[PDB]
Copies of this chain bind each other. A is one copy, B any other.
Amino acid sequence: MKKNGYPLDRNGKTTECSGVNAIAPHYCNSECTKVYYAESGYCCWGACYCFGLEDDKPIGPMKDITKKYCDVQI
Contact = CB atoms under 8 A, between A and B. Distances in A.
Q: Which of A26, A29, A73 has the most CB of B within 10 A?
A: A73
Given A40-B73, A73-B74, A74-B74, A23 B25 contact: no
Contacts of A23: 22-23
Copies in the complex: 2
A42 interface: yes
A72 B41 CA distance: 9
Residues of A in contact with B, size category: 10 to 19
Interface string A61-74: 00000000000111
Given A23-B23, A29-B72, 5 more contacts: A25-B73, A42-B42, A42-B73, A73-B74, A74-B74
